Design a protein around this ligand. Structure first.
Ligand SMILES: *[C@@H]1O[C@H](CO)[C@@H](O[C@@H]2O[C@H](CO)[C@@H](O)[C@H](O)[C@H]2NC(C)=O)[C@H](O)[C@H]1NC(C)=O
Ligand SMILES: *[C@@H]1O[C@H](CO)[C@@H](O[C@@H]2O[C@H](CO)[C@@H](O)[C@H](O)[C@H]2NC(C)=O)[C@H](O)[C@H]1NC(C)=O
Ligand code: NAG
Ligand code: NAG
Ligand code: NAG
Ligand code: NAG
Ligand code: NAG
Ligand code: NAG
Ligand code: NAG
Ligand code: NAG
Ligand code: NAG
Ligand code: NAG
Lengths: 118, 95, 37, 86, 320, 37, 99, 49, 50, 46
């Protein structure tokens, strides 16, 4: 009905009272809407975003890169052995079982480094 | 409502295709026209054949065509003034 | 004049891959040893 | 913000004393930079000198003591430090 | 100045930054390329046969820097009347195209051209809109004209050698311009002066309006570039558009001034410090790393610092 | 919490690693006194 | 003399001050919503009724860039004063004494 | 400020590098919080049992 | 007419973001003072006797 | 201060602060701010 916007729509287990037309929580943005035809109630949560970080060993040493997609479960993003962690997920880095002193801090306990050999 | 042409002439030694270096295409002209352009073609200079058994078609020719697009390109200028190394931003994540 | 000609042949336009080509000077300004975006 | 323009400087008086404050704040932290160096280095009353014969028990201080044939009479290690900070 | 700055009648000892100092520029200059074109205007006024209004022709003039004062400040053309924009302001402006009509009317029907009154020659031969057609130019003539030019119903004109005034055979040339929509093409003569060097001047190098001193540079552009720029985008070097010569631009000196008071329960004497500037360009005069100091004598002793100047130099009220 | 532009980054040492640091500090001040520092 | 960037604490103070002074000058080429970022060109191309509206957009944008700079130098100088109070205590207690 | 709206995002470019400066300030105080914990707790060479 | 209305939202939101970031710099200099005292209290009181 | 003169009906928009034209620039110039009022009426009868 003119309430334009962007997001994904899912079926809402929350309820309305039959005089209510949409909903909101905080800061004027709408969370739920009753559609004009079916009169079904649908949730509006926005389709995922994040930040992108890039891990490099230094161009003087090599020209290779891993990429961190911050705070996103990457079933929704290359292809070189992806690895989901707490700080996002890494693409282009090889998860190992050893342990060393920290070189490049990824976050939440994970570090990254370049050694022999990707 | 302008028309800008940029050019260069470069010696080469590769077999067929494009080389690897950098080319600073400096502008030739700019033409105050205002014409609305959306399709183009290229002119060939064919000569008459004569007493050799239509009567046209000189030589053999080929050219390469590729269309702009906007991005961001960074130029690492020389001390002379010359653009030497060009950086592309949307190429890859490293760029 | 207007002597048409073309035949038909053409096959698939051979493609290729220019590596780093086509960087024109987008200005008149003169910069000296200074990366510019 | 104006840069030699009289009709710009006339409009800036409508804002009052926004620029008496900014010059006062930047002068307060320039005087502070001199009080910083005075409190670290002026810890000594007199300018002492080392004796010309140096019998220090076997200890050698020649790289941290100054050099009398040198610009600024700096020490040896004091010149490695000044040739590394751009 | 200091008392006014502190809004008090007594100042204590110290050094107070009280105003600024700048060299004001003299004798502004402008430097523009060259005037190579003359403009096609040889082909409108010195042509032999001019038509009449029954066959009003048009002549498009483009891509020149023409002139507009060698037909206005000179006066032999009997008719120089047009409206709105005065002909002194056509040299500083320009549209996209210039068009030239030509017809020869006696003088009794020349007067109907003043847009707002369409003529008998202008309702059925040459369409005059509600807007003013740019300029109408006519002059008396007896060389190749002073008959066989008609207009409009269809009637001929009477021309002879013994015809009283009002019937003179003028030469009406109409000037009009294009919508100038797209980029223009035809301006007047641009303007230049004589350049100076090594003094604070107010310059204009084909568009760059700033202030500074102009010294000769030993740098090298590429043959298509016009001016240079430093880091953080400041123009340092330009090219002289007549002589193809590179000139540096450094700003003519500025700074702050400061006064050294021993306090007003002690004296009314003052020294003044002009920050980072050479006394060469506006008691004794003493040059310091902190800018030169005027009104204080440079002793050759060493005491404790009392009022700080900078770079190791101090001062205090000793009777000077 | 993430709403709109807002992000919360995770700290580099987790709470298990910080507890393992303060257990190695407490096992040296019991065993060795002040000699381990 | 072989290993550079051992003075990395002292290089970061010089680099951060130059970064903030470089960003003060590059904000002079911003429009802030006016038609031109050079104060002489809206002068030579507009009448003093309309030029007053455009200059008041450049003044408000350039005054905000100068207040942001002074505020970030007031916070940054409070961190240097903490480090110089520590070097004045380390010179008393460790050069002139034994701690 | 804008929030996925390209008419706003072009008008924001007339304000220079305000956003850039704002991102550079909040990253410098996120890296600092990781150094604050490294100085208190990591004061030991080995892990003693 | 949308541009003269959007610009009123831009200058108000850019000011609400600067007031946030300025007050987070002042608050994070109070934590660095208190995380410097906690580091001295571990050197001088856990690793030694005061 | 009451100031009176006769003007064409076309130029009743020319008497305004911050206006340029023929009469506002060569006959009578109101200043830029101008706290005041501008009163006008037709005089085809006279
Ligand atoms: C420039 O010319 C082209 C015509 O080739 C115009 O582009 C479109 O052309 C198609 C035909 O291929 C028409 O169906 C469209 O209607 C045209 N576009 C529009 C927006 O009308 C183009 O419009 C011309 N440009 C200008 C400024 O007139
Ligand atoms: C004190 O130490 C300095 C080192 O800085 C010694 O000076 C060097 O001595 C060697 C001889 O073994 C020379 O080859 C070097 O050229 C000296 N370096 C200088 C003079 O800068 C010095 O000999 C030591 N003094 C004593 C008394 O042992
Ligand atoms: C609108 O039409 C749809 C199907 O076309 C159906 O839900 C119903 O007939 C109507 N819904 C209303 C009026 O809410
Ligand atoms: C590359 O890095 C090493 C250490 O990381 C450094 O010593 C060296 O100067 C750098 N440059 C080259 C060209 O090796
Ligand atoms: C990530 O997605 C998978 C399937 O898409 C799911 O099983 C898993 O729980 C998700 N992880 C988190 C932390 O939500
Ligand atoms: C690394 O550890 C995981 C979990 O114990 C195991 O599945 C994997 O096989 C190990 N990798 C290697 C190379 O041993
Ligand atoms: C060839 O050109 C002629 C015009 O000269 C045209 O009538 C004819 O259709 C064209 N045929 C082909 C195959 O192009
Ligand atoms: C040609 O016409 C111009 C009008 O611009 C006039 O000044 C000039 O004297 C004419 N030439 C001669 C030879 O009369
Ligand atoms: C410009 O004209 C002058 C004559 O006044 C001449 O000396 C100079 O060489 C000309 N320069 C160019 C670039 O045409
Ligand atoms: C300085 O001024 C005070 C009063 O303002 C006065 O009592 C004092 O004597 C003055 N100093 C000298 C040296 O006279
Ligand atoms: C100051 O300027 C004068 C004027 O040319 C010059 O002679 C003098 O050498 C300058 N002094 C310094 C220290 O640069
Ligand atoms: C102070 O130094 C200068 C050095 O140029 C010297 O000429 C002068 O004589 C000295 N003062 C006295 C009082 O000797």
């Amino acid at each position: 009905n003119g309430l334009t916007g962007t997001g994904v729509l899912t079926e809402s287990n929350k309820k309305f009272l039959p005089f209510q037309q949409f909903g909101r929580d905080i800061a004027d943005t709408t969370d739920a809407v009753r559609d004009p035809q079916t009169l079904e109630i649908l949730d509006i949560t926005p389709c995922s975003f994040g930040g992108v970080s890039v891990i490099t060993p230094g161009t003087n040493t090599s020209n290779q890169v891993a990429v961190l997609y911050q705070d996103v479960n990457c079933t929704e993003v290359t292809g070189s052995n992806v690895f989901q962690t707490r700080a996002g997920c890494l693409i282009g880095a090889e998860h190992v079982n050893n342990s060393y002193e920290c070189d490049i801090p990824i976050g939440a306990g994970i570090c990254a480094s370049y050694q022999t050999q990707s | 409502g302008y028309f800008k042409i940029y050019s260069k002439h470069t010696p080469i030694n590769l077999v067929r295709d494009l080389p690897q270096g950098f080319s600073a295409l400096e502008p030739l002209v700019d033409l105050p026209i205002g014409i609305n352009i959306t399709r183009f073609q290229t002119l060939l200079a064919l000569h008459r054949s004569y007493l050799t058994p239509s009567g046209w078609t000189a030589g053999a020719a080929a050219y390469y065509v590729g269309y702009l697009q906007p991005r961001t390109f960074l130029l690492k200028y020389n001390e002379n003034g010359t653009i030497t190394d060009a950086v592309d931003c949307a190429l890859d994540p490293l760029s | 004049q207007c002597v048409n000609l073309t035949t038909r042949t053409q096959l698939p336009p051979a493609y290729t891959n220019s590596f780093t080509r086509g960087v024109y000077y987008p200005d008149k300004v003169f910069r000296s040893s200074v990366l510019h975006s | 913000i104006c840069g030699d323009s009289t009709e710009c400087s006339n409009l800036l008086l409508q804002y009052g004393s926004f620029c008496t404050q900014l010059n006062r704040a930047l002068t307060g932290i320039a005087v502070e930079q001199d009080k910083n160096t005075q409190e670290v280095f002026a810890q000594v009353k007199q300018i002492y000198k080392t004796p010309p014969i140096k019998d220090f028990g076997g200890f050698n201080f020649s790289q941290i003591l100054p050099d009398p044939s040198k610009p600024s009479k700096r020490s040896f290690i004091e010149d490695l430090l000044f040739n590394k900070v751009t | 100045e200091t008392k006014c700055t502190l809004k008090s009648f007594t100042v204590e000892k110290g050094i107070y930054q009280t105003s600024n100092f700048r060299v004001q520029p003299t004798e502004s200059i402008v430097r523009f390329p060259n005037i190579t074109n003359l403009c096609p205007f040889g082909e409108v006024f010195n042509a032999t046969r001019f038509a009449s209004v029954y066959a009003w022709n048009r002549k498009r003039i483009s891509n020149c820097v023409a002139d507009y004062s060698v037909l206005y400040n000179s006066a032999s053309f009997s008719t120089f009347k047009c409206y709105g924009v005065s002909p002194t302001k056509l040299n500083d402006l320009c549209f996209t195209n210039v068009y030239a009509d030509s017809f020869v009317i006696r003088g009794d029907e020349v007067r109907q051209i003043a847009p707002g009154q369409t003529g008998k020659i202008a309702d059925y031969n040459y369409k005059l809109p509600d807007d003013f057609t740019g300029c109408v130019i006519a002059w008396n003539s007896n060389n190749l004209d002073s008959y066989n030019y008609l207009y409009r119903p269809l009637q001929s004109y009477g021309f002879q050698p013994t015809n009283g005034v009002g019937y003179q055979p003028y030469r009406v040339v109409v000037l009009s311009f294009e919508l100038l929509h797209a980029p223009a093409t035809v301006c007047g003569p641009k303007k230049s002066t004589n350049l100076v060097k090594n003094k604070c001047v107010n310059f204009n190098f084909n568009g760059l309006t700033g202030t500074g001193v102009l010294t000769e540079s030993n740098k090298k552009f590429l043959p298509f570039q016009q001016f240079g720029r430093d880091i953080a985008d400041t123009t340092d070097a330009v090219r002289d558009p007549q002589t193809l010569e590179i000139l540096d631009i450094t700003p003519c000196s500025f700074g702050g001034v400061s006064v050294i008071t021993p306090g007003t329960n002690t004296s009314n004497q003052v020294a003044v410090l002009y920050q980072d500037v050479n006394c060469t360009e506006v008691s004794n005069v003493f040059q310091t790393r902190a800018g030169c100091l005027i009104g204080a004598e440079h002793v050759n002793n060493s005491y404790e610092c009392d009022i700080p100047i900078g770079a190791g130099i101090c001062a205090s009220y000793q009777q000077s | 919490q993430k709403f709109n532009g807002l992000t919360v980054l995770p700290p580099l040492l987790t709470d298990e690693m910080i507890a393992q640091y303060t257990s190695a500090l407490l096992a040296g001040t019991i065993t060795s006194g002040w000699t381990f520092g | 003399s072989s290993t550079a960037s051992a003075l990395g604490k002292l290089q970061d103070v010089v680099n951060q001050n130059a970064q903030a002074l470089n960003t003060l000058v590059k904000q002079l080429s911003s429009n802030f919503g006016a038609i031109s970022s050079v104060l002489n060109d809206i002068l030579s191309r507009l009448d003093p009724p309309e030029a007053e509206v455009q200059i008041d957009r450049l003044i408000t944008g350039r005054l905000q860039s100068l207040q942001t700079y002074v505020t970030q130098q007031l916070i940054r100088a409070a961190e240097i004063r903490a480090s110089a109070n520590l070097a004045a205590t380390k010179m008393s207690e460790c050069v002139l004494g034994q701690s």
